[PDB]
């Protein structure tokens, strides 16, 4: 034994225990989801209200990369911010050289290679976040989820954090019951519901809902936050479904 004390050490199994320990920090975090719709993507996240002293709508968690990509993460929040900062450098250098805004698959591999690099050496610690991200490019909508190991795939729906099993089940129903696809406005409503349903795992403290979207029709293929009347409409729909 001792194989789990140092990063980049293969156990006799062929496992990197330090990466597996990072996943535990992710599992410990709040619930965050992603839904791929007809012409775009929707992101949502659970924000635990620790105290009445927290200013509502102010501690924003979802982050924009370039103008077309949304990122949301569960686990160590600072680690997520560090990864998005790197993401913004990658997207800036791509646009500087190639002119076109970075495609989503291209962007995914930039984060992927960077996170994978933090499993190659004992001088660094793996990332304590799973990141759900995506947006709209020239080839249409793309949703991705990226784990501490550097592993990422494309998703129809994605979920991570404490309420992930609950969320995954609700996402699996939508995929089966809508093979022709889901509209952007529908996906915002369904996103609100799934966070409310996933809140049963964090039922001790009350929470604040936060949604964002990129849609070719609804936002012109730019990342925007859901605000005001459209946010309240999605909260009302979510509150109706739990009762």
């Amino acid at each position: 034994t001792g194989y789990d004390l140092s990063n980049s050490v293969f156990s006799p199994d062929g496992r990197n225990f330090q990466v597996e320990y990072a996943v535990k920090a992710v599992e410990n975090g709040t619930t965050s989801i992603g839904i791929k719709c007809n012409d775009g993507v929707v992101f949502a996240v659970e924000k635990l209200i620790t105290s009445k002293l927290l200013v509502p709508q102010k501690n924003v968690k979802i982050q924009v990369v370039d103008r077309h990509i949304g990122c949301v993460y569960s686990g160590l929040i600072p680690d997520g911010r560090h990864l998005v900062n790197r993401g913004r450098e990658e997207a800036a250098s791509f646009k500087k050289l190639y002119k076109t805004p970075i495609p989503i698959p291209a962007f995914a591999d930039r984060l992927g290679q960077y996170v994978q690099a933090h499993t190659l050496y004992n001088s660094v610690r793996p990332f304590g976040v799973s990141t759900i991200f995506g947006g709209v490019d020239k080839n249409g909508a793309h949703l991705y989820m990226l784990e501490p190991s550097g592993s990422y795939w494309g998703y129809k729906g994605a979920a991570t954090g404490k309420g992930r099993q609950s969320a995954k089940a609700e996402l699996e129903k939508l995929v089966d019951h809508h093979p022709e696809g889901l509209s952007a406005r529908e996906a915002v409503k369904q996103a609100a519901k799934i966070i409310y349903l996933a809140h049963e795992d964090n039922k001790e403290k009350d929470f604040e809902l936060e949604i964002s979207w990129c849609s070719l029709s609804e936002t012109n293929g730019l990342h925007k936050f859901v605000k005001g009347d459209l946010l309240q409409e999605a909260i009302d729909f979510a509150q109706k479904e739990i009762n």
Binding site: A117, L120, Y121, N122, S123, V124
Partner: protein, 250 residues
Amino acid sequence: MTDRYSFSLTTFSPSGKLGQIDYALTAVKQGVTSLGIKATNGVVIATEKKSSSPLAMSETLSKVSLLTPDIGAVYSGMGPDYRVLVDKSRKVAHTSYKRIYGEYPPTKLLVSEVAKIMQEATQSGGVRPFGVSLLIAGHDEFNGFSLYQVDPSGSYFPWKATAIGKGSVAAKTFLEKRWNDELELEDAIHIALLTLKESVEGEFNGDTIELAIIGDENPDLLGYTGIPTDKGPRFRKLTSQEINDRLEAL
């Protein structure tokens, strides 16, 4: 990131042993048998092509390598370590000799350069020693024919004939009884094939044996005429057919 292993991974133990060099020599012992014999008019180096799978094409894996037109190398131990040493050995023959003196290094000096690379893996920060022993055979105008062994420590010794790896102890005894100072090259090849048969379990033919000589100049292998002082390489790898012909007179 940064390489934060700036300290030695090979140190002296209380008994005065260098552990990582001893363990490297153990890895060499587990490796397949290779040998070298020096004749009056040439040198022969030989080894078994231990094929990992029959689907593998063993012609694509070269255990006997040209370093310069007049110097060849064979090994026992870890093949990958040997491959990168052959790359570094070829480059250092140019950078630290041919680019300065306009001629290929003599056998003893190239050996010295390979030894120096292997010594540095024994003392430099954050590296393990090379897990190979090399046998280097060569010719040069002022020293004639020569055969050298190089160990993981960086130590090198000249030999009349020797063997390294799996069945070295038995092979060296066989060579001591057969070797004299009046051997022709054909006689040394005959002895090399006899010696190598003892250490081989399975098939013994031109497809499972790798054998090269340092002999006469080969003008047919030079690739151009018109310069009288360039008469071609002394290193020649024997063909599958050329080995099988000498196995009938065995």
